[PDB]
């Protein structure tokens, strides 16, 4: 298991524009197109990302390319973030994958706002962090995903992803 497989599990793969859990236009493997309510704006953003007139449909290869770019960006965002970097550097490989997942889902800004959890993770207080992470809108809105990620931080193993 790795970050790619992990997020491929969490995000799924859709080759036609769709609405995510928050009702935002997305495509591929959780690639957010826009927060705008306009499907046109979304089709526009898609063509611009893909480089061609897509008509709101992409191929698997195009989806996977967006995905690689998105993972890359997430990592890069963490490394550049003063609040995230030190956390990320302190973690083992499995847990780092769990931080990337959060960043991918909620953005660097979003995650950097979990100050208390971040601090606990940095201190390696797993159970404590897990409890604090759960007191969040994130967990109440996407409880099953949140649980998988939280378990990953708690255990440092991929057990929550084994079986899927």
From Swiss-Prot:
<keyword id="KW-0204">Cytolysis</keyword>
<keyword id="KW-0929">Antimicrobial</keyword>
<dbReference type="InterPro" id="IPR023347">
    <property type="entry name" value="Lysozyme_dom_sf"/>
</dbReference>
<feature type="binding site">
    <location>
        <position position="32"/>
    </location>
    <ligand>
        <name>substrate</name>
    </ligand>
</feature>
<comment type="similarity">
    <text>Belongs to the glycosyl hydrolase 24 family.</text>
</comment>
<feature type="binding site">
    <location>
        <position position="104"/>
    </location>
    <ligand>
        <name>substrate</name>
    </ligand>
</feature>
<feature type="binding site">
    <location>
        <position position="117"/>
    </location>
    <ligand>
        <name>substrate</name>
    </ligand>
</feature>
<dbReference type="GO" id="GO:0042742">
    <property type="term" value="P:defense response to bacterium"/>
</dbReference>
<feature type="active site" description="Proton donor/acceptor">
    <location>
        <position position="20"/>
    </location>
</feature>
<keyword id="KW-0081">Bacteriolytic enzyme</keyword>
<feature type="active site" description="Proton donor/acceptor">
    <location>
        <position position="11"/>
    </location>
</feature>
<dbReference type="InterPro" id="IPR052619">
    <property type="entry name" value="Phage_lysozyme-like"/>
</dbReference>
<dbReference type="GO" id="GO:0003796">
    <property type="term" value="F:lysozyme activity"/>
</dbReference>
<keyword id="KW-1035">Host cytoplasm</keyword>
<protein>
    <recommendedName>
        <fullName>Endolysin</fullName>
        <ecNumber>3.2.1.17</ecNumber>
    </recommendedName>
</protein>
<dbReference type="InterPro" id="IPR002196">
    <property type="entry name" value="Glyco_hydro_24"/>
</dbReference>
<dbReference type="GO" id="GO:0030430">
    <property type="term" value="C:host cell cytoplasm"/>
</dbReference>
<feature type="binding site">
    <location>
        <position position="132"/>
    </location>
    <ligand>
        <name>substrate</name>
    </ligand>
</feature>
<keyword id="KW-0326">Glycosidase</keyword>
<keyword id="KW-0378">Hydrolase</keyword>
<comment type="function">
    <text>Endolysin with lysozyme activity that degrades host peptidoglycans and participates with the holin and spanin proteins in the sequential events which lead to the programmed host cell lysis releasing the mature viral particles. Once the holin has permeabilized the host cell membrane, the endolysin can reach the periplasm and break down the peptidoglycan layer.</text>
</comment>
<dbReference type="Pfam" id="PF00959">
    <property type="entry name" value="Phage_lysozyme"/>
</dbReference>
<keyword id="KW-0578">Host cell lysis by virus</keyword>
<dbReference type="InterPro" id="IPR001165">
    <property type="entry name" value="T4-type_lysozyme"/>
</dbReference>
<dbReference type="GO" id="GO:0009253">
    <property type="term" value="P:peptidoglycan catabolic process"/>
</dbReference>
<dbReference type="GO" id="GO:0044659">
    <property type="term" value="P:viral release from host cell by cytolysis"/>
</dbReference>
<dbReference type="GO" id="GO:0016998">
    <property type="term" value="P:cell wall macromolecule catabolic process"/>
</dbReference>
<dbReference type="InterPro" id="IPR023346">
    <property type="entry name" value="Lysozyme-like_dom_sf"/>
</dbReference>
<dbReference type="InterPro" id="IPR034690">
    <property type="entry name" value="Endolysin_T4_type"/>
</dbReference>
<keyword id="KW-1188">Viral release from host cell</keyword>
């Amino acid at each position: 298991m790795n970050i790619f497989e992990m997020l491929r599990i969490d995000e799924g793969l859709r080759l036609k524009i769709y609405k995510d859990t928050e009702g935002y236009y997305t495509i591929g493997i959780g690639h957010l197109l826009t927060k705008s309510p306009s499907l046109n704006a979304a089709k526009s953003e898609l063509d611009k990302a893909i480089g061609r007139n897509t008509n709101g449909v992409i191929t698997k290869d195009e989806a996977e390319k967006l995905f690689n770019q998105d993972v890359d960006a997430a990592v890069r965002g963490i490394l550049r973030n003063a609040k995230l970097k030190p956390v990320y550097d302190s973690l083992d490989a499995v847990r780092r994958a769990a931080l990337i997942n959060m960043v991918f889902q909620m953005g660097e800004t979003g995650v950097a706002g979990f100050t208390n959890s971040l601090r606990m993770l940095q201190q390696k207080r797993w159970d404590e962090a897990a409890v604090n992470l759960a007191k969040s809108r994130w967990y109440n809105q996407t409880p099953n995903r949140a649980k998988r990620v939280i378990t990953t931080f708690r255990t440092g193993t991929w057990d929550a992803y084994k079986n899927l």
